[PDB]
Amino acid sequence: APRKGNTLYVYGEDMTPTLLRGAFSPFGNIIDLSMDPPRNCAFVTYEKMESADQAVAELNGTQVESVQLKVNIARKQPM
């Protein structure tokens, strides 16, 4: 049966897939990975709800070689 799953909202500047994959690869396996180049945002889906909460708490409040990323939760209401 289908499950709601748990997609996380990722925001930041100059963000790439290889970088995000590593920012969510070790946090757990992703069933689907999406990225938004027009809004500079990215979406991360986790098969385990704990993989999203553990990655959102560890990824949230972090910095890169010289950039800052932001993790948020998708709104229940559809855009």
Curated annotation (Swiss-Prot):
Residues found modified as Phosphothreonine: 16, 18
Domain (RRM): residue spans on this chain: 6-76
Annotated positions of the Phosphoserine modification: 25
SS bond list: none
Tissue distribution: Widely expressed. Expressed in heart, brain, lung, placenta, liver, skeletal muscle, kidney and pancreas.
Record's comment on post-translational modification: Phosphorylated by the P-TEFb complex at sites next to its RNA recognition motif, promoting its release from chromatin.
Similarity section: Belongs to the RRM NELF-E family.
Domain notes from UniProt: The RRM domain interacts with RNA, and is essential for NELF complex function. It is however not required for the NELF complex formation.
Function: Essential component of the NELF complex, a complex that negatively regulates the elongation of transcription by RNA polymerase II. The NELF complex, which acts via an association with the DSIF complex and causes transcriptional pausing, is counteracted by the P-TEFb kinase complex. Provides the strongest RNA binding activity of the NELF complex and may initially recruit the NELF complex to RNA. (Microbial infection) The NELF complex is involved in HIV-1 latency possibly involving recruitment of PCF11 to paused RNA polymerase II.
Protein name: Negative elongation factor E
Taxonomic lineage of the native organism: Eukaryota, Metazoa, Chordata, Craniata, Vertebrata
The gene coding this protein: NELFE
Residues included from the entire protein: 257 to 335 of 380
